[PDB]
Design a protein around this nucleic acid. Structure first.
Lengths: 142, 182, 59, 126
RNA sequence: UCAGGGUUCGAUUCCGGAGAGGGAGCCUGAGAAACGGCUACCACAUCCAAGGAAGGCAGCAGGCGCGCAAAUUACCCACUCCCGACCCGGGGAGGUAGUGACGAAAAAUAACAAUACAGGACUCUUUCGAGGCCCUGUAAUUGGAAUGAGUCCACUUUAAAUCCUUUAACGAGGAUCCAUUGGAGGGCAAGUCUGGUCGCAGCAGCCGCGGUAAUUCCAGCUCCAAUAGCGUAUAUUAAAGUU
């Protein structure tokens, strides 16, 4: 309520809504494309890179742990992304200066859990999954 | 070319109330999965949508007459509805279970020769029945009303006339090469 | 204690015992798995006074 | 076995000089018998003798019990031999094909294209 | 996708349009500013006896490169149509097969008796107890019965063949002719079981678990959900009367 309800006010409605839609956060990222330019991804689900070097990443309080991530440079941008490594002992199955395949966490822009500064994780080392390396139904191909 | 789905999934993923109904319904009729249940309920809820239109259309609109007349004939022809009803209000009184009575495996058990319902499905698949002259292998035949008085066993089977199976004729050859020459 | 640093990975998984008791018994599929599920819950017919039991209880 | 040959929608197709019907066949404990055997019985149902009869089709339904095909019967041989697609005549032999596989044609054609006046080498000679 | 009103997508089998490495010009013809025609410049790239000459796969296959990301240098004018001087010739148009868990439809992976315990209506008996009926799983072995999964002669299919359907002959005793993918603290269907670890290692969309008694970690057993499918990442709609 508190607004026009004319019969010839189609212009004053459809131009107002087209302006006040930009104050929404979601809409403003989709249509400016500043999302694409700023992201290390092109909007692609995955991406591929080459390892730079292992790191240890401290946890946010209350939790205290060391989380053993990696840091990676990409093939098609040359810029750098810091990527989590999953389950116990899977760090060892990643060896420095090889290729890897990365993927987002599942929150689509934001850092997940108690680990800060990480927005990406790792899925395949070299056409072989972290699962089959971990479980033992496959072996290192080298 | 042209393809479409014949079922839908429930909006809720879990719900204690729902799951028990779907389980106990599958137990009675010997169904393999919930996909065999939701299939039925898609067709039914489709028919419940079409009916829900025509009741709101003007009485003695030509669209309302021709559709309803030929619709109710089809519901009567499969035998989920009576002609002592024969109006659109009784479409909404129709429900899920009445369909399942007209399934082939249900009619084998109910009006023919079977043990438990779990047996009867196996007989349909192992080609021991026919529908009038024609072998079937599909327990989801849904059976027209006229064809209920032609459900018979098959004319080539060990059940009734026709050649025995390989369990019998094996043991017959155990009388000749298992203890007759071996 | 913790000796030989606590940054070490493979720690918990490389010092646990590994045991099994893999099945000889074949489990059912498709139709019969639902048949047993129906009978074991509803058509037994056991239930008694108000209780919390669940379908599992290794307590 | 004892089998039945049974008509279905006859036509006296004067323009092509033939008689075309459906070949509706019932087989009791068997089904799917040679097409050669079928045209014998149709020979001794219209007395036209089995070299001007031609049949094809014959897909067999589930469980046996029926098979349905499509048959022609020509008045004379020469009306068949003229009209008839080649492979149906060669189906019970009196014709063949050669010609010879495929390809050897196109690679010769493009070589013939690049000469003028004399192409008799390439036609025999490569 | 959706109650009503909408929102989002449309390279892509039909119709219209534009373009054949980038620009420009032009010949022929009824029709073209044509690229399976031509000429020139520009960017490329090939052969050469160095005098010269020849080229444009956003046609079908195929290769390199690019990337998260995508098939056979197969068979054939029989169908469907087109082109010609033509009833006869030609067509990578088009049809056929191969690869194919994009996706959709169909529905196997054990059914039935014997014994064995087990339950309750029913009957007898004061009750105990016994009989007995309806069924249930569950042990023990089995027994009888059935079938395609496969293997496979023949017929059929078709341009020739495959597949499918049709039919010989072999083909089920559960140990194998083997169903997996996730989960069991709450949201949310299912363990305050056993062993190991001790704020370490890890789990955790979210809330939170781990500091020696861990229902959440690593394993075992059991249980739950969906099922020939299930999980994960990302775009997007509904949920959002949070446009």
């Amino acid at each position: 309520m508190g607004k026009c309800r004319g019969l010839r006010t189609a212009r004053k409605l459809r131009s107002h809504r087209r302006d006040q839609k930009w104050h929404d956060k979601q809409y403003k990222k989709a249509h400016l494309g500043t999302a694409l330019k700023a992201n290390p991804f092109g909007g692609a689900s995955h991406a591929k890179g080459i390892v730079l070097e292992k790191v240890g990443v401290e946890a946010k309080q209350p939790n205290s742990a060391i989380r053993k991530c990696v840091r990676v440079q990409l093939i098609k941008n040359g810029k750098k992304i810091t990527a989590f490594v999953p389950n116990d002992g899977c760090l060892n199955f990643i060896e420095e200066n090889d290729e890897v395949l990365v993927a987002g966490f599942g929150r689509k822009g934001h850092a997940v859990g108690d680990i800060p500064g990480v927005r990406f994780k790792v899925v395949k080392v070299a056409n072989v999954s972290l699962l089959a390396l971990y479980k033992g139904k496959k072996e290192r191909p080298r | 070319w042209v393809c479409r789905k014949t079922y839908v999934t429930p909006r809720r993923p879990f719900e204690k109330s729902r799951l028990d109904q779907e389980l106990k319904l599958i137990g009675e009729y010997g169904l393999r999965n919930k996909r065999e249940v939701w299939r039925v309920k898609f067709t039914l809820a489709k028919i419940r949508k079409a009916a829900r239109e025509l009741l709101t259309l003007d009485e003695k609109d030509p669209r309302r007459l021709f559709e309803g007349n030929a619709l109710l004939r089809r519901l009567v022809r499969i035998g989920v509805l009576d002609e002592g009803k024969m109006k659109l209000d009784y479409i909404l009184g129709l429900k899920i279970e009445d369909f399942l009575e007209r399934r082939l495996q249900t009619q084998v058990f109910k009006l023919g020769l079977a043990k438990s319902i779990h047996h009867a499905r196996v007989l349909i698949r192992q080609r021991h029945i026919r529908v009038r002259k024609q072998v079937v292998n599909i327990p989801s035949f849904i059976v027209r009303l006229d064809s209920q008085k032609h459900i018979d066993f098959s004319l080539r089977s060990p059940y009734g006339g026709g050649r025995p199976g390989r369990v019998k004729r094996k043991n017959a050859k155990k009388g000749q090469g298992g203890a007759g020459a071996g | 204690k913790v000796h030989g640093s606590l940054a070490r990975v493979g720690k918990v998984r490389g010092q646990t015992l590994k045991v099994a008791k893999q099945e000889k018994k074949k489990k059912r599929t498709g139709r019969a798995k639902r048949r047993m599920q129906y009978n074991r819950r509803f058509v037994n017919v056991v239930p008694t006074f108000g209780k919390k039991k669940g379908p599992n209880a290794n307590s | 076995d004892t089998v039945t040959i049974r008509t279905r929608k006859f036509m006296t197709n004067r323009l092509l000089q033939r008689k075309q019907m459906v070949i509706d066949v019932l087989h009791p404990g068997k089904a799917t018998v040679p097409k050669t055997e079928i045209q014998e019985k149709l020979a001794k149902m219209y007395k036209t003798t089995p070299d001007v009869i031609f049949v094809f089709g014959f897909r067999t339904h589930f469980g046996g019990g029926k098979t349905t095909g499509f048959g022609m019967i020509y008045d004379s041989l020469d009306y068949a031999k003229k009209n008839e697609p080649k492979h149906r005549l060669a189906r019970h032999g009196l014709y063949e094909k050669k010609k010879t596989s495929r390809k050897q044609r196109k690679e010769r054609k493009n070589r013939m294209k690049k000469v003028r006046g004399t192409a008799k080498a390439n036609v025999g000679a490569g």
